[PDB]
mmCIF file of all heavy atoms in Angstrom:
data_model
loop_
_atom_site.group_PDB
_atom_site.id
_atom_site.type_symbol
_atom_site.label_atom_id
_atom_site.label_comp_id
_atom_site.label_asym_id
_atom_site.label_seq_id
_atom_site.Cartn_x
_atom_site.Cartn_y
_atom_site.Cartn_z
ATOM 1 N N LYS A 15 202.875 48.525 173.966
ATOM 2 C CA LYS A 15 201.686 49.341 173.947
ATOM 3 C C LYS A 15 200.614 48.834 173.002
ATOM 4 O O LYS A 15 199.437 48.930 173.272
ATOM 5 C CB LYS A 15 202.034 50.813 173.660
ATOM 6 C CG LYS A 15 202.825 51.535 174.724
ATOM 7 C CD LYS A 15 203.149 52.969 174.294
ATOM 8 C CE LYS A 15 204.267 53.483 175.202
ATOM 9 N NZ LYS A 15 204.519 54.930 174.910
ATOM 10 N N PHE A 16 201.039 48.343 171.822
ATOM 11 C CA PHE A 16 200.141 47.814 170.827
ATOM 12 C C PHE A 16 199.478 46.567 171.358
ATOM 13 O O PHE A 16 198.314 46.283 171.048
ATOM 14 C CB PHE A 16 200.937 47.488 169.539
ATOM 15 C CG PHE A 16 200.037 47.024 168.404
ATOM 16 C CD1 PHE A 16 199.628 47.958 167.417
ATOM 17 C CD2 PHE A 16 199.587 45.755 168.303
ATOM 18 C CE1 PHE A 16 198.798 47.552 166.367
ATOM 19 C CE2 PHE A 16 198.767 45.282 167.266
ATOM 20 C CZ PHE A 16 198.362 46.222 166.275
ATOM 21 N N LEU A 17 200.189 45.804 172.182
ATOM 22 C CA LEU A 17 199.638 44.620 172.787
ATOM 23 C C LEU A 17 198.581 44.983 173.826
ATOM 24 O O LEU A 17 197.482 44.386 173.829
ATOM 25 C CB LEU A 17 200.722 43.796 173.461
ATOM 26 C CG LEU A 17 200.317 42.472 174.116
ATOM 27 C CD1 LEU A 17 199.651 41.543 173.076
ATOM 28 C CD2 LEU A 17 201.569 41.786 174.699
ATOM 29 N N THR A 18 198.906 45.933 174.673
ATOM 30 C CA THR A 18 197.963 46.396 175.687
ATOM 31 C C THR A 18 196.644 46.818 175.048
ATOM 32 O O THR A 18 195.568 46.269 175.350
ATOM 33 C CB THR A 18 198.500 47.622 176.432
ATOM 34 O OG1 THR A 18 199.826 47.374 176.845
ATOM 35 C CG2 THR A 18 197.656 47.920 177.631
ATOM 36 N N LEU A 19 196.770 47.773 174.114
ATOM 37 C CA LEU A 19 195.598 48.245 173.352
ATOM 38 C C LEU A 19 194.850 47.133 172.667
ATOM 39 O O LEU A 19 193.619 47.039 172.799
ATOM 40 C CB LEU A 19 196.047 49.296 172.306
ATOM 41 C CG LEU A 19 195.153 49.492 171.072
ATOM 42 C CD1 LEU A 19 193.768 49.940 171.618
ATOM 43 C CD2 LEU A 19 195.717 50.493 170.183
ATOM 44 N N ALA A 20 195.541 46.290 171.934
ATOM 45 C CA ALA A 20 194.992 45.178 171.230
ATOM 46 C C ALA A 20 194.256 44.170 172.139
ATOM 47 O O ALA A 20 193.492 43.348 171.703
ATOM 48 C CB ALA A 20 196.040 44.458 170.422
ATOM 49 N N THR A 21 194.494 44.312 173.459
ATOM 50 C CA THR A 21 193.839 43.374 174.415
ATOM 51 C C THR A 21 192.924 44.075 175.427
ATOM 52 O O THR A 21 192.498 43.433 176.372
ATOM 53 C CB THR A 21 194.893 42.586 175.155
ATOM 54 O OG1 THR A 21 195.830 43.470 175.798
ATOM 55 C CG2 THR A 21 195.645 41.646 174.215
ATOM 56 N N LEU A 22 192.692 45.366 175.238
ATOM 57 C CA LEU A 22 191.841 46.123 176.134
ATOM 58 C C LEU A 22 190.552 45.336 176.383
ATOM 59 O O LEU A 22 190.004 45.353 177.464
ATOM 60 C CB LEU A 22 191.519 47.476 175.574
ATOM 61 C CG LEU A 22 192.186 48.682 176.274
ATOM 62 C CD1 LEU A 22 191.876 49.971 175.532
ATOM 63 C CD2 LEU A 22 191.703 48.806 177.699
ATOM 64 N N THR A 23 190.086 44.698 175.293
ATOM 65 C CA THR A 23 188.884 43.927 175.362
ATOM 66 C C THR A 23 189.187 42.522 174.783
ATOM 67 O O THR A 23 189.973 42.328 173.921
ATOM 68 C CB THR A 23 187.715 44.530 174.535
ATOM 69 O OG1 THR A 23 188.335 45.261 173.436
ATOM 70 C CG2 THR A 23 186.952 45.495 175.400
ATOM 71 N N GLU A 24 188.534 41.520 175.375
ATOM 72 C CA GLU A 24 188.680 40.132 174.929
ATOM 73 C C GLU A 24 188.488 40.113 173.402
ATOM 74 O O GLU A 24 187.337 40.234 172.932
ATOM 75 C CB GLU A 24 187.736 39.196 175.621
ATOM 76 C CG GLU A 24 188.142 37.786 175.638
ATOM 77 C CD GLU A 24 187.062 36.873 176.256
ATOM 78 O OE1 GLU A 24 186.582 37.188 177.345
ATOM 79 O OE2 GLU A 24 186.775 35.802 175.666
ATOM 80 N N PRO A 25 189.569 39.939 172.622
ATOM 81 C CA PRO A 25 189.453 39.869 171.192
ATOM 82 C C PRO A 25 188.262 39.063 170.672
ATOM 83 O O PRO A 25 187.825 38.106 171.332
ATOM 84 C CB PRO A 25 190.808 39.247 170.782
ATOM 85 C CG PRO A 25 191.759 39.789 171.790
ATOM 86 C CD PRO A 25 190.953 39.647 173.079
ATOM 87 N N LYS A 26 187.655 39.490 169.546
ATOM 88 C CA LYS A 26 186.515 38.815 169.002
ATOM 89 C C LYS A 26 186.769 37.302 168.950
ATOM 90 O O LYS A 26 185.863 36.497 169.271
ATOM 91 C CB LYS A 26 186.161 39.390 167.624
ATOM 92 C CG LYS A 26 184.809 38.892 167.114
ATOM 93 C CD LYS A 26 184.614 39.187 165.665
ATOM 94 C CE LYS A 26 183.480 38.340 165.059
ATOM 95 N NZ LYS A 26 183.403 38.389 163.608
ATOM 96 N N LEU A 27 187.954 36.940 168.508
ATOM 97 C CA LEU A 27 188.334 35.525 168.395
ATOM 98 C C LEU A 27 189.372 35.133 169.441
ATOM 99 O O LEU A 27 190.453 35.733 169.417
ATOM 100 C CB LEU A 27 188.887 35.250 166.990
ATOM 101 C CG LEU A 27 188.003 35.681 165.859
ATOM 102 C CD1 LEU A 27 188.760 35.557 164.511
ATOM 103 C CD2 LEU A 27 186.708 34.813 165.716
ATOM 104 N N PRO A 28 189.050 34.199 170.331
ATOM 105 C CA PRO A 28 189.984 33.802 171.379
ATOM 106 C C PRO A 28 191.197 33.095 170.841
ATOM 107 O O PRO A 28 191.256 32.726 169.636
ATOM 108 C CB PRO A 28 189.129 32.903 172.288
ATOM 109 C CG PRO A 28 188.178 32.304 171.301
ATOM 110 C CD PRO A 28 187.775 33.452 170.441
ATOM 111 N N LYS A 29 192.157 32.772 171.734
ATOM 112 C CA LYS A 29 193.388 32.060 171.338
ATOM 113 C C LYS A 29 193.118 30.588 171.091
ATOM 114 O O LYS A 29 193.905 29.898 170.482
ATOM 115 C CB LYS A 29 194.454 32.246 172.371
ATOM 116 C CG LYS A 29 195.069 33.659 172.401
ATOM 117 C CD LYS A 29 195.671 34.040 173.783
ATOM 118 C CE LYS A 29 196.934 33.204 174.094
ATOM 119 N NZ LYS A 29 197.512 33.622 175.358
ATOM 120 N N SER A 30 191.971 30.091 171.612
ATOM 121 C CA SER A 30 191.619 28.713 171.452
ATOM 122 C C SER A 30 190.691 28.518 170.235
ATOM 123 O O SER A 30 190.221 27.404 169.952
ATOM 124 C CB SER A 30 190.875 28.168 172.726
ATOM 125 O OG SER A 30 189.705 28.949 172.973
ATOM 126 N N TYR A 31 190.407 29.628 169.525
ATOM 127 C CA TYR A 31 189.602 29.644 168.354
ATOM 128 C C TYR A 31 190.129 28.703 167.255
ATOM 129 O O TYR A 31 191.376 28.678 167.022
ATOM 130 C CB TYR A 31 189.395 31.054 167.793
ATOM 131 C CG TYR A 31 188.684 31.136 166.526
ATOM 132 C CD1 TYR A 31 187.288 30.833 166.509
ATOM 133 C CD2 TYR A 31 189.285 31.474 165.315
ATOM 134 C CE1 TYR A 31 186.576 30.867 165.245
ATOM 135 C CE2 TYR A 31 188.577 31.498 164.150
ATOM 136 C CZ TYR A 31 187.249 31.205 164.135
ATOM 137 O OH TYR A 31 186.521 31.261 162.937
ATOM 138 N N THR A 32 189.254 28.030 166.573
ATOM 139 C CA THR A 32 189.626 27.128 165.486
ATOM 140 C C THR A 32 188.544 26.993 164.467
ATOM 141 O O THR A 32 187.471 26.336 164.792
ATOM 142 C CB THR A 32 189.951 25.720 166.003
ATOM 143 O OG1 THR A 32 188.900 25.211 166.806
ATOM 144 C CG2 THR A 32 191.256 25.743 166.823
ATOM 145 N N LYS A 33 188.673 27.617 163.320
ATOM 146 C CA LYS A 33 187.673 27.511 162.250
ATOM 147 C C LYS A 33 187.557 26.047 161.830
ATOM 148 O O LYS A 33 188.507 25.498 161.299
ATOM 149 C CB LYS A 33 188.041 28.317 161.068
ATOM 150 C CG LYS A 33 186.911 28.748 160.132
ATOM 151 C CD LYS A 33 187.319 28.735 158.698
ATOM 152 C CE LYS A 33 186.268 29.341 157.798
ATOM 153 N NZ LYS A 33 186.112 30.800 158.042
ATOM 154 N N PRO A 34 186.382 25.419 162.073
ATOM 155 C CA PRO A 34 186.185 24.018 161.747
ATOM 156 C C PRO A 34 186.831 23.679 160.366
ATOM 157 O O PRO A 34 186.467 24.279 159.349
ATOM 158 C CB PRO A 34 184.694 23.874 161.699
ATOM 159 C CG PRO A 34 184.260 24.750 162.819
ATOM 160 C CD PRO A 34 185.161 26.008 162.609
ATOM 161 N N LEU A 35 187.751 22.727 160.359
ATOM 162 C CA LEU A 35 188.463 22.357 159.133
ATOM 163 C C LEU A 35 187.471 21.953 158.056
ATOM 164 O O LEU A 35 187.781 21.939 156.889
ATOM 165 C CB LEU A 35 189.393 21.174 159.444
ATOM 166 C CG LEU A 35 190.636 21.081 158.570
ATOM 167 C CD1 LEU A 35 191.391 22.437 158.483
ATOM 168 C CD2 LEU A 35 191.607 20.053 159.165
ATOM 169 N N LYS A 36 186.242 21.614 158.527
ATOM 170 C CA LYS A 36 185.186 21.195 157.573
ATOM 171 C C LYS A 36 184.735 22.410 156.751
ATOM 172 O O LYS A 36 184.202 22.282 155.605
ATOM 173 C CB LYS A 36 183.986 20.629 158.338
ATOM 174 C CG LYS A 36 184.224 19.273 158.995
ATOM 175 C CD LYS A 36 182.975 18.813 159.756
ATOM 176 C CE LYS A 36 183.230 17.567 160.548
ATOM 177 N NZ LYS A 36 183.131 16.315 159.714
ATOM 178 N N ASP A 37 184.847 23.590 157.368
ATOM 179 C CA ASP A 37 184.481 24.810 156.721
ATOM 180 C C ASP A 37 185.572 25.519 155.972
ATOM 181 O O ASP A 37 185.376 26.535 155.298
ATOM 182 C CB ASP A 37 183.886 25.771 157.749
ATOM 183 C CG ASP A 37 182.771 25.142 158.562
ATOM 184 O OD1 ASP A 37 182.040 24.321 158.029
ATOM 185 O OD2 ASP A 37 182.588 25.557 159.735
ATOM 186 N N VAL A 38 186.781 25.006 156.090
ATOM 187 C CA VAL A 38 187.960 25.538 155.399
ATOM 188 C C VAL A 38 187.736 25.554 153.904
ATOM 189 O O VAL A 38 187.702 24.492 153.291
ATOM 190 C CB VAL A 38 189.265 24.778 155.707
ATOM 191 C CG1 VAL A 38 190.407 25.281 154.817
ATOM 192 C CG2 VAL A 38 189.623 24.940 157.189
ATOM 193 N N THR A 39 187.604 26.746 153.332
ATOM 194 C CA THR A 39 187.322 26.885 151.862
ATOM 195 C C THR A 39 188.643 26.908 151.029
ATOM 196 O O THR A 39 188.816 25.956 150.258
ATOM 197 C CB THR A 39 186.550 28.247 151.580
ATOM 198 O OG1 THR A 39 186.518 28.441 150.154
ATOM 199 C CG2 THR A 39 187.234 29.394 152.317
ATOM 200 N N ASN A 40 189.448 27.892 151.214
ATOM 201 C CA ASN A 40 190.681 27.964 150.483
ATOM 202 C C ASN A 40 191.936 27.780 151.365
ATOM 203 O O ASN A 40 191.779 27.360 152.495
ATOM 204 C CB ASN A 40 190.795 29.309 149.703
ATOM 205 C CG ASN A 40 190.791 30.490 150.637
ATOM 206 O OD1 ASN A 40 189.952 30.590 151.537
ATOM 207 N ND2 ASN A 40 191.753 31.398 150.493
ATOM 208 N N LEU A 41 193.110 28.149 150.821
ATOM 209 C CA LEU A 41 194.315 28.029 151.575
ATOM 210 C C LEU A 41 195.163 29.311 151.588
ATOM 211 O O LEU A 41 196.395 29.265 151.655
ATOM 212 C CB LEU A 41 195.155 26.888 151.037
ATOM 213 C CG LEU A 41 194.480 25.495 150.924
ATOM 214 C CD1 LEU A 41 195.437 24.461 150.373
ATOM 215 C CD2 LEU A 41 193.979 25.070 152.302
ATOM 216 N N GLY A 42 194.468 30.435 151.494
ATOM 217 C CA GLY A 42 195.145 31.735 151.489
ATOM 218 C C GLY A 42 196.107 31.924 150.354
ATOM 219 O O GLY A 42 195.981 31.303 149.285
ATOM 220 N N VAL A 43 197.140 32.718 150.550
ATOM 221 C CA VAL A 43 198.176 33.033 149.529
ATOM 222 C C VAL A 43 199.388 32.139 149.743
ATOM 223 O O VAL A 43 199.897 31.993 150.851
ATOM 224 C CB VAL A 43 198.584 34.505 149.580
ATOM 225 C CG1 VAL A 43 199.583 34.775 148.482
ATOM 226 C CG2 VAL A 43 197.352 35.386 149.424
ATOM 227 N N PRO A 44 199.958 31.530 148.675
ATOM 228 C CA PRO A 44 201.089 30.628 148.728
ATOM 229 C C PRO A 44 202.212 31.352 149.459
ATOM 230 O O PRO A 44 202.492 32.555 149.249
ATOM 231 C CB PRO A 44 201.398 30.375 147.250
ATOM 232 C CG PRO A 44 200.024 30.331 146.654
ATOM 233 C CD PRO A 44 199.356 31.558 147.292
ATOM 234 N N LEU A 45 203.041 30.543 150.200
ATOM 235 C CA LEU A 45 204.165 31.129 150.899
ATOM 236 C C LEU A 45 205.428 31.135 150.041
ATOM 237 O O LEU A 45 205.518 30.372 149.060
ATOM 238 C CB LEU A 45 204.424 30.330 152.201
ATOM 239 C CG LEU A 45 203.241 30.190 153.148
ATOM 240 C CD1 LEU A 45 203.750 29.534 154.443
ATOM 241 C CD2 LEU A 45 202.656 31.519 153.440
ATOM 242 N N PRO A 46 206.405 31.965 150.352
ATOM 243 C CA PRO A 46 207.674 32.042 149.627
ATOM 244 C C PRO A 46 208.519 30.802 149.754
ATOM 245 O O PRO A 46 208.566 30.122 150.755
ATOM 246 C CB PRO A 46 208.348 33.284 150.212
ATOM 247 C CG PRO A 46 207.862 33.206 151.631
ATOM 248 C CD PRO A 46 206.423 32.923 151.512
ATOM 249 N N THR A 47 209.267 30.515 148.658
ATOM 250 C CA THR A 47 210.098 29.316 148.610
ATOM 251 C C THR A 47 211.428 29.587 149.301
ATOM 252 O O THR A 47 212.169 30.531 148.975
ATOM 253 C CB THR A 47 210.408 28.884 147.148
ATOM 254 O OG1 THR A 47 209.239 28.254 146.605
ATOM 255 C CG2 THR A 47 211.563 27.876 147.113
#
């Protein structure tokens, strides 16, 4: 149901979306070891 709802409308960002690596500022939060 969460999937249905979450897709009622074409999400703002498509699945083919890719933030230009040239614009990549930081690297988010470090992952667990």
Side-chain angles (χ1 to χ4, degrees):
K15 292 179 196 184
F16 185 97
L17 181 57
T18 310
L19 157 59
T21 55
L22 251 175
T23 32
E24 201 184 312
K26 191 192 164 190
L27 307 170
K29 286 156 71 178
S30 59
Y31 175 69
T32 52
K33 201 217 189 68
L35 209 49
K36 291 177 186 280
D37 307 329
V38 172
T39 170
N40 62 309
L41 306 181
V43 183
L45 306 187
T47 286

